[PDB]
């Protein structure tokens, strides 16, 4: 509709003026601008309600499932006969449905309101973990690899960032089995080498210590808890097919470039302060330059709107970051867990970056990407945030230039700068 | 300057709206971004390269030991510089 | 190890200050080309500058021949041209 309006107005102006590019830019008279017919205890309660807001989906789903389950088991008491009896007794598919009541469960419902000081918060937190086991497992795997830097703990995060975060809203059963069996194998081997009969040690990750199993019972238990929950609820060449199903499909479209670039900016803040706070500085300067390079490449991939390019770049990025961080740097300088908490934190922020890019690759770019990240609503906050974003050196500089280089435009650079400055001032 | 730009445009026109040439956009953007990242970064390179005094061995060439009871006179003074000053062998370091 | 006494003043608000100074100064200077660029857009987007060019050349020509009153009258015309953007739209309109 907007383009219909604009083309109508342009046709009217052409007809009126009826009565080779610089000529069309330098064609403006006053006949354009003439009127076209004008056409404090409550903080814990707030935290609990916010957690319930996060987990309302699983709460309602579990309520429906348990309401069904009570009648299901009370009928199963005798034999268990008809699948249609359990549905219609109290329309096969519908998310949130309401029918007659059962006295026992409705009596049990308000019992939680009896305990409301902290027990509500504990229940909400546990239910949040139950509603995000899929993310708890990724966080535990990444944390385990953040300590005990070793290839044995490096083959798994590469999988998490390359395969489990790209397939299908349910990462396939083969992946969970792979991670569970692999952590079985690589805790059994660690324990076997923990024996005293056997004498690189650190790189292969089979070293012997007092805490030889570190965040490895937690990782195994998280994997198994997720498998159990995904089992009780729900359902539990080839590479080319995997890629082709990744590209061509119907998906929701979401944009997370704001957060992706925000994670990269936090990452450079981390590099700057771990350079100033302490060899490795000769590694973090090169890493700072590569951060600039990967921000520029990511910005180009975003403007040009290529999901395939993002997939290739994210594979390259995850492989290169892991290999570099865990082999190249620990040889040029010290271990990454003995010291360099800055390195641990930088890796964690880059892991958030990788998860966001994987989500963006799964969901595919939307339409309507242009327009500033802060100028959607003219409230009293967007103005201060926009002024602050303008105040930092060399962003609007680079934002304007990179937005020009990769957008399809007919304007030269000076004209582009004029348009962008006019828009900033007018906003 | 404006007159020369108009004359150049008239001599070599551009049609009623064409994609700006990809090559010129890439070259100009690359040049500008390279400069704006050089200014951001090369200061850090110089600042963390000048403060890189590399480990260089500074072996004491002359050692002198004296034993002076009160303020009377050195009972025993000695200085051994070239031959008696010997560095470790690596295996001696392992022994230590 | 031995190091040249070229340490001077190190990091820890010693030398990071000069780097912040240089990055902020260059940031302001470079923003000089991108921030107030929209204002001087009535003096740099003229379609056809032939008439102003002839006026400037006539000021120079009449200054050349030791003829002076005409220089003041022509300068008056030029100043009133840059003092009235609607007449500098009338006066640099692309000739029909």
């Amino acid at each position: 509709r907007q383009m219909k309006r604009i083309r109508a107005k342009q046709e009217k102006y052409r007809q009126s003026q009826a009565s080779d590019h610089a000529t069309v830019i330098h064609s403006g008279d006053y006949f354009l601008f003439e009127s076209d017919s004008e056409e404090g205890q409550a903080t814990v309660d707030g935290l609990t309600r916010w957690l319930r807001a996060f987990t309302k989906h699983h709460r309602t789903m579990s309520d429906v499932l348990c309401a069904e389950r009570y009648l299901l088991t009370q009928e199963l008491l005798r034999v268990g006969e008809v699948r249609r009896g359990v549905l219609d007794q109290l329309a096969s598919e519908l998310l949130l449905d309401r029918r007659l009541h059962i006295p026992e469960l409705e009596e049990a419902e308000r019992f939680e309101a009896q305990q409301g000081r902290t027990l509500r918060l504990l229940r909400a937190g546990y239910q949040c973990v139950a509603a995000h086991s899929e993310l708890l497992c990724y966080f535990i795997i990444i944390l385990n690899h953040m300590v005990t830097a070793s290839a044995a703990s490096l083959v798994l995060p590469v999988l998490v960032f390359l395969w489990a975060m790209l397939t299908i809203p349910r990462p396939s059963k083969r992946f969970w089995m792979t991670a569970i069996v692999f952590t079985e194998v690589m805790v059994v081997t660690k324990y076997l080498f923990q024996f005293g009969f056997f004498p690189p040690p650190r790189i292969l990750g089979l070293e012997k210590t007092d805490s030889y199993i570190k965040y490895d019972l937690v990782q195994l238990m998280a994997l198994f808890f997720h498998r159990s929950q995904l089992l009780c609820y729900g359902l539990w060449p080839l590479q080319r097919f995997f890629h082709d199903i990744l590209h061509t499909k119907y998906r929701a479209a979401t944009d997370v470039y704001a957060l992706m670039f925000l994670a990269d900016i936090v990452d450079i803040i981390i590099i700057i302060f771990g350079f100033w706070a302490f060899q490795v500085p000769q590694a973090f300067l090169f890493m700072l330059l590569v951060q600039f390079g990967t921000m520029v490449i990511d910005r180009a991939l975003y403007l040009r709107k290529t999901v395939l390019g993002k997939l290739a770049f994210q594979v390259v990025l995850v492989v290169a970051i892991h290999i570099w961080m865990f082999f190249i740097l620990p040889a040029v300088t010290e271990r990454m867990f003995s010291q360099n908490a800055v390195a641990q934190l930088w890796y964690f922020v880059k892991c958030i970056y990788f998860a966001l890019s994987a989500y963006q690759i799964r969901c595919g770019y939307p339409t309507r990407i242009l327009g500033n990240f802060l100028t959607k609503k003219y409230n009293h906050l967007n103005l201060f945030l926009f002024q602050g974003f303008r105040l930092v050196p060399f962003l609007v500089e680079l934002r304007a230039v990179m937005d020009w280089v990769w957008t399809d435009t007919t304007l030269s650079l000076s004209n582009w700068m004029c348009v962008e400055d006019i828009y900033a001032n007018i906003f | 300057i404006i007159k020369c730009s108009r004359e150049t445009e008239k001599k070599y026109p551009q049609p009623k709206g064409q994609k700006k040439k990809k090559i010129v956009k890439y070259g100009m953007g690359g040049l500008i971004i390279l400069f704006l990242i050089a200014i951001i970064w090369f200061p850090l390179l110089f600042m963390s390269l000048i403060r890189s005094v590399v480990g260089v061995v500074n072996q004491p060439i002359d050692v002198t030991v004296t034993l002076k009871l009160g303020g009377y006179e050195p009972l025993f003074t000695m200085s051994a510089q070239q031959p008696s000053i010997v560095p470790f062998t690596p295996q001696a370091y392992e022994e230590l | 190890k031995v190091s040249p006494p070229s340490l001077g003043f190190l990091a820890g608000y010693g030398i990071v200050g000069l780097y912040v100074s240089i990055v902020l100064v260059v940031g302001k200077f470079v923003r000089g080309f991108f921030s107030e660029i929209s204002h001087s857009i009535m003096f740099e987007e003229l379609p056809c500058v032939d008439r102003i060019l002839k006026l400037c050349q006539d000021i120079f020509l009449v200054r050349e021949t030791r003829e002076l009153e005409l220089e003041e009258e022509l300068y008056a015309k030029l100043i009133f041209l840059y003092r009235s953007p609607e007449t500098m739209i009338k006066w640099t309109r692309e000739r029909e």
């Binding site: 030269s412 650079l413 000076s414 700068m417 | 300057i1 404006i2 730009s5 108009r6 040439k21 090559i23 010129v24 070259g27 100009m28 040049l31 | 080309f33 740099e44 987007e45």
Partner: peptide
């Protein structure tokens, strides 16, 4: 690829920032 006009007008827009049109 490249050309002889491409570098020329790259230089044009590189002197187009500092100076007027």
């Amino acid at each position: 690829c490249c050309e002889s006009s491409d570098c020329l007008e790259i230089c044009m827009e590189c002197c187009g920032i500092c100076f007027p049109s």
